[PDB]
């Protein structure tokens with residue numbers, strides 16, 4: 001419903017963000033009965049998730065054809081820690097119980113957040129405003145079991161505590177336990193503070209043990225015209241496979257300001273980040289200490305039928321030095337309800353620890369660089385909200401291994417051309433939400449398709465209510481995809497064919513406190529893989545409930 005904060009770090013109406021923008025709320029996730037973050041994300045425009053099996057296995061996110069490491073995943077506005085040792089976001093381990101909102105903005109945004117924000121940004125928000133206590137649970141195929149307790153209460157005027165415990169367990173598997181607490185205090189009606197803690201202990205079967213904890217603390221000012229935020233953040237994760245141990249601590253501090261001016265806004269902040277890893281983390285001998293500080297400017301202005309939006313950033317990285325990025329967007333509502341939008345942006349990706357200092361390291365690498373153009377038409381027609389975008393993304397200085405000298409070097413190039421189309425509309429009691437993605441992602445030097453990516457995807461959601469039963473059908477076509485066959489050397493490129501997949505979900509309020517839900521995932525039990533060799537789930541049944549007071 002209308003607001004985002006992820007585009008410039010502060011609240012604005014979505015109609016005011018010129019980049020394509022998806023919002024997923026807790027209500028959606030409960031209806032969809034998602035038992036992981038991937039299942040939430042896989043439903044959205046330009047998202048191509050591949051996974052080495054069912055839930056908990058290593059996964060990669062390809063937003064609009066870009067590399068796994070070319071999406072910025074934020075947790076409550078701060079770069080996901082799990083992402084820091086390898087330089088590529090993998091959310092298979094992150095607990096769905098913590099996801100209260102997802103804001104997903106496509107197109108570049110390094111001009112606000114710095115490194116990784118190339119294909120787009122996915123911000124997972126863990127805060128809810130929803131007082132009262134809840135107990136939920138579920139049971140499903142592969143002996144899935146879930147138990148969950150949460151409460152949000154007032155501790156008098158001005159203060160609130162939120163607490164959550166979640167236990168999720170499956171067999172052949174993947175066990176996950178999660179604890180979250182938060183305190184929110186309002187000093188005046190304009191001034192706020194918060195302290196927020198959470199941690200999860202996961203186990204995945206070769207046997208993996210991931211633990212992570214995050215602590216965030218901040219001050220906010222929310223005036224009639226001025227807005228300010230000061231947030232400090234600390235993450236500690238530890239990742240065992242067995243005796244290999246990857247450990248990282250990530251510290252972040254960021255001060256941002258924004259003022260309403262005219263019909264629009266101007267903003268600015270400063271951003272600092274430190275990452276220390278343990279000796280032997282990322283198959284690198286020594287422990288490292290990496291630092292980054294960035295300063296940026298945002299702006300938004302509406303003049304008559306035109307909207308202009310922009311951001312500009314400079315980052316100083318302890319390893320590669322200085323890199324600047326920028327982006328600008330103009331939109332023209334040429335007739336009421338219809339709008340052309342043109343965007344241009346630059347973005348980048350920092351080298352990772354392995355590329356820099358691993359056995360094959362090159363300590364002098366520069367960032368990977370993206371330039372993107374996009375053009376869109378959006379409209380409201382006869383009750384249909386729609387949008388169609390075409391984009392071009394030239395990526396250069398890709399960090400590639402050279403076999404001859406056994407070192408990483410900047411040299412590869414990629415060209416992505418894509419089309420995004422979306423629509424939502426109702427027909428009597430039925431709500432339809434539909435998207436189509438075309439992605440022609442290639443190596444620009446050799447002109448061959450990049451690997452692991454569906455060239456086409458079609459995604460359709462159908463929701464309705466009949467007798468207090470709330471039903472959701474979800475359909476997805478996963479198009480043809482090229483991959484390597486690793487069972488035989490030299491590794492040949494294989495073609496994986498298109499697949500249709502259907503899910504069926506329902507919910508019923510037994511009483512005003514008690515809702516029961518059931519789901520059949522992959523209803524037609526289709527055999528398929530998103531990584532060659534790795535078998536996905538098959539038809540699965542889940543059954544759950546929630547008791548509120």
Ligand SMILES: CCCCCCCCOCCOCCOCCOCCO
Pocket residue numbers: 261262263264265266299300301
């Ligand atoms: C390739 C050319 C690069 C040129 C960069 C120019 C930067 C823009 O300068 C003009 C800024 O003017 C608009 C300011 O926006 C702030 C919004 O508030 C203004 C209220 O109407």
Ligand SMILES: CCCCCCCCOCCOCCOCCOCCO
Pocket residue numbers: 266297298299300301308309310311312326327328
């Ligand atoms: C006082 C300037 C505040 C905004 C600067 C951030 C945007 C930097 O890139 C913009 C350069 O491209 C041309 C911009 O012209 C249109 C105005 O940009 C929208 C901000 O109102």
Ligand SMILES: CCCCCCCCOCCOCCOCCOCCO
Pocket residue numbers: 312326
């Ligand atoms: C606040 C808005 C900032 C927008 C600025 C974007 C415009 C960038 O234009 C200059 C790009 O840099 C050119 C570098 O110089 C040419 C490279 O060749 C020199 C050899 O070292």
Ligand SMILES: CCCCCCCCOCCOCCOCCOCCO
Pocket residue numbers: 268295296297312313314323324325326
């Ligand atoms: C108030 C913060 C505004 C600072 C952000 C501006 C950075 C935008 O950089 C755009 C990239 O421009 C390319 C050229 O940058 C190279 C630096 O040149 C320095 C000496 O020429």
Ligand SMILES: CCCCCCCCOCCOCCOCCOCCO
Pocket residue numbers: 335338377378379
């Ligand atoms: C790719 C962008 C193309 C957008 C095409 C839209 C062109 C004009 O849109 C329709 C103009 O409005 C007519 C709407 O239908 C008649 C309703 O008239 C008002 C009701 O009294």
Ligand SMILES: CCCCCCCCOCCOCCOCCOCCO
Pocket residue numbers: 375376377388389390391392417418419
């Ligand atoms: C203005 C909205 C974009 C329209 C997209 C669909 C129309 C296709 O028209 C011709 C396509 O030309 C072939 C190239 O297709 C992929 C290009 O994607 C856009 C990047 O340049």
Ligand SMILES: CCCCCCCCOCCOCCOCCOCCO
Pocket residue numbers: 386387388419421422423434435436438
């Ligand atoms: C879609 C092209 C014509 C103008 C926009 C119509 C509204 C689109 O919304 C529905 C999107 O549904 C998927 C349609 O897929 C066909 C369009 O693909 C463009 C291929 O170049």
Ligand SMILES: *SCC1=CC(C)(C)N(O)C1(C)C
Pocket residue numbers: 004005006007009010011076077123125126127229
């Ligand atoms: S979208 C920015 C955002 C994330 C969260 C920390 C939940 N917030 O307080 C803001 C609005 C800074």
Ligand SMILES: [Mg+2]
Pocket residue numbers: 169170171173174175
């Ligand atoms: Mg077990």
Ligand SMILES: [Mg+2]
Pocket residue numbers: 169171
């Ligand atoms: Mg058991």
Ligand SMILES: [Mg+2]
Pocket residue numbers: 320364365366
């Ligand atoms: Mg250099």
Ligand SMILES: [Mg+2]
Pocket residue numbers: 512513
């Ligand atoms: Mg009652």
